[PDB]
From a paper:
Here, we report the structure of the F. tularensis enzyme and show that it is fused to 6-hydroxymethyl-7,8-dihydropterin pyrophosphokinase (FtHPPK) which catalyzes the previous step in the pathway. DHPS acts at a crucial convergence point in the folate pathway, and catalyzes the condensation of p-aminobenzoic acid (pABA) and 6-hydroxymethyl-7,8–dihydropterin-pyrophosphate (DHPPP) to form the intermediate dihydropteroate. The N-terminal FtHPPK module is connected to the C-terminal FtDHPS module by a structured linker region, and the structures of each module are very similar to those of the monofunctional enzymes. The structure reveals the molecular organization of the resulting bifunctional enzyme, and we also demonstrate that each active site binds substrate in the same manner observed in the monofunctional forms.
One of the compounds, 2-(7-amino-1-methyl-4,5-dioxo-1,4,5,6-tetrahydorpyrimido[4,5-c]pyridazin-3-yl)propanoic acid (Compound 1), is a low molecular weight fragment-like molecule that is well suited for elaboration and further development, and it was of interest to evaluate its binding within the F. tularensis enzyme. The small molecule binds within the pterin pocket in exactly the same way as the B. anthracis enzyme, engaging the pterin recognition residues Asp255, Asn277, Asp346, and Lys383 and a structural water molecule in hydrogen bonding and electrostatic interactions, and the guanidinium moiety of Arg418 in a π-stacking interaction. Intriguingly, Compound 1 was also found within the pterin pocket of the FtHPPK module. Similar to the HPPK substrate and consistent with its pterin-like structure, the molecule stacks between the conserved phenylalanine side-chains (Phe59 and Phe129) and forms a hydrogen bonding interaction with Asn61. However, comparing the ‘nitrogen faces’ of Compound 1 and DHP that dictate their similar binding to the DHP pocket, a rotation of ∼40° is revealed which orients the nitro moiety proximal to the Mg2+ ion within the divalent metal binding site. To accommodate the molecule, the Mg2+ ion is shifted nearly 4 Å, presumably to coordinate the partial negative charge associated with the nitro group. A consequence of this rotation is that the ‘nitrogen face’ does not directly engage residues 43–47 but instead interacts with loop H2 via a water molecule that occupies this void. Finally, in the absence of AMPcPP, residues 89–96 in loop H3 remain disordered, and Trp95 does not enclose the pterin pocket. Thus, while Compound 1 closely mimics the binding of substrate in the FtDHPS module, it only partially mimics substrate binding in the FtHPPK module. In contrast, the presence of the DHPS inhibitor in the pterin pocket of FtHPPK is very surprising and has important implications for drug discovery.
Numbering used by the authors: 1 to 45, 56 to 88, 97 to 215, 220 to 303, 325 to 350, 374 to 389, 391 to 422
The structure:
C-alpha cells in the first residue's frame, strides 16, 4: 500500500463533470481507496482550466497506475477533456522514460502544486528536501482557488431573465450579466436560466431571451474563471427544441416545471442525452414514460415542488422558510442556513438565488 497524489485537470466540455468522473473511475478500482480530494483551481489555458488533486492509497505499482490513468483518460474521452498525472508518491523518486515521480513539472505548475500541498501541507520534494515548497508556490504566482467544490451537493444558481428582474438603465442591460458573475464567484456549480416569471409569453419571445443570453455566455467562455453546467428552465416543448438545436453543446440539463407533451419532450431529451427533472406539480408514471422513450434513469432527477436523485428548490420560498413581507436580505438567510443543512444531508442538487 502506497499513497499517491493524482493531479486532474480539464478545460473542455462539462469541466466539473469530467473531474468528478475521473475520480469516480479511480474510486471504483478495487485496489484503490480515495483518501482526500483537494479544492478546485482555475488557471488560464482557449478556455479556463479546472484543476484539482486526489490523495489515494493503492497497491498499484507506479507503472501499473500509469496504465490505469491512460485508460481513464480514454473513458472520459480525451482543449483537453481530462489530464491525469501521478504528482507524487510519498518520498518516492523514480526516473524512467515512461515516468518520473515526482512529476517533472510539479514544481513548475501552480495548478498542480497548490492542490498537492493542500492535500499534504508537510510535503517535501524528495529530490530537494531543503526546498520549502510554500515559497515556490508563491513564486509561481497566479492561481485562483474556486468556491465551487467536489461536494456531493451541487449548488444550482438561478438566473431569471423574466420581468421580475428588471432594472435596465438608459444605456445598460448589465444586470443579468452581473448576476451570472456573482453566482459564479460565490461557487454555483450549476446555472439554471429561465425566461419567465404574470402575462404569458410566446415561444418566440421565450426563445429570444434564452438564446441571447446563451450566445452571451458562449462569448464569455474564455473569460469565466469557472464554466458552470447549464440548466435550461422552461416548460415549453418548442423552446427546448430550438434552444437544444442551437446550444446543446453547452447545456447539461432541462428543468421543466409543467408537463405537457411529456411524450415528445422525452423523445427530445433522449436524442440529446441530457439530464431531466421531475417536479410536482406519481413521479413513477412520468419516470416510466421517460424511461420508456429511451431516457436512462440516472440522467433524471425528481423535485417535490414547493409551490432517482433529488433536486430541491427552496430558495426565497416563505412557505418552507416559515412564510412574507420579509426582505431579500432575510429571505436568503433562511435559505442559506437551510442550504447549509441539506448539504449535510444527501441532497444531490439545490436551486438557490444566493449560495
Ligand atoms: Mg499527462
Amino acid at each position: 500500500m502506497v499513497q499517491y497524489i493524482i493531479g486532474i485537470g480539464t478545460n473542455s466540455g462539462f469541466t466539473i463533470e469530467n473531474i468528478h468522473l475521473a475520480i469516480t473511475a479511480l474510486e471504483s478500482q478495487q485496489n484503490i481507496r480515495i483518501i482526500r480530494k483537494a479544492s478546485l483551481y482555475s488557471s488560464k489555458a482557449d478556455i479556463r482550466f479546472l484543476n484539482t488533486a486526489v490523495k489515494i492509497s493503492s497497491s498499484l505499482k507506479p507503472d501499473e497506475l500509469l496504465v490505469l490513468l491512460k485508460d481513464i483518460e480514454l473513458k472520459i474521452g480525451r482543449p483537453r477533456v481530462i489530464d491525469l498525472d501521478i504528482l507524487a508518491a510519498e518520498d518516492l523518486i523514480l526516473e524512467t522514460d515512461k515516468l518520473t515521480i515526482p512529476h517533472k513539472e510539479l514544481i513548475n505548475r501552480s495548478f498542480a502544486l497548490a492542490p498537492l500541498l493542500e492535500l499534504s501541507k508537510g510535503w517535501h520534494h524528495p529530490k530537494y528536501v531543503e526546498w520549502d515548497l510554500n515559497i515556490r508556490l508563491k513564486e509561481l504566482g497566479e492561481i485562483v482557488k474556486l468556491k465551487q467544490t467536489l461536494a456531493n451537493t451541487i449548488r444550482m444558481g438561478i438566473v431569471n431573465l423574466s420581468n421580475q428582474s428588471f432594472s435596465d438603465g438608459n444605456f445598460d442591460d448589465n444586470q443579468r450579466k452581473l448576476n451570472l458573475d456573482e453566482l459564479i464567484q460565490s461557487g454555483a456549480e450549476i446555472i439554471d436560466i429561465g425566461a419567465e416569471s404574470a402575462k404569458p409569453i410566446s415561444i418566440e419571445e421565450e426563445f429570444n431571451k434564452l438564446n441571447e443570453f446563451l450566445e452571451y455566455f458562449k462569448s464569455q467562455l474564455a473569460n469565466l474563471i469557472y464554466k458552470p453546467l447549464v440548466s435550461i428552465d422552461t416548460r415549453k416543448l418548442e423552446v427546448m427544441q430550438k434552444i437544444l438545436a442551437k446550444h446543446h453543446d453547452i447545456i447539461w440539463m432541462i428543468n421543466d416545471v409543467e408537463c405537457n407533451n411529456i411524450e415528445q419532450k422525452a423523445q427530445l431529451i433522449a436524442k440529446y442525452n441530457k439530464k431531466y427533472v421531475i417536479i410536482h406539480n406519481y413521479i413513477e408514471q412520468k419516470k416510466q414514460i421517460l424511461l420508456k422513450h429511451g431516457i436512462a434513469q440516472q440522467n433524471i432527477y425528481f423535485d417535490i415542488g414547493f409551490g432517482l436523485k433529488a433536486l430541491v428548490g427552496h430558495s426565497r420560498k416563505p412557505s418552507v422558510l416559515g412564510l412574507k413581507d420579509s426582505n431579500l436580505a432575510t429571505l436568503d438567510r433562511a435559505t442559506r442556513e437551510l442550504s447549509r443543512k441539506l448539504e449535510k444531508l444527501d441532497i444531490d442538487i439545490i436551486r438557490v438565488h444566493k449560495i
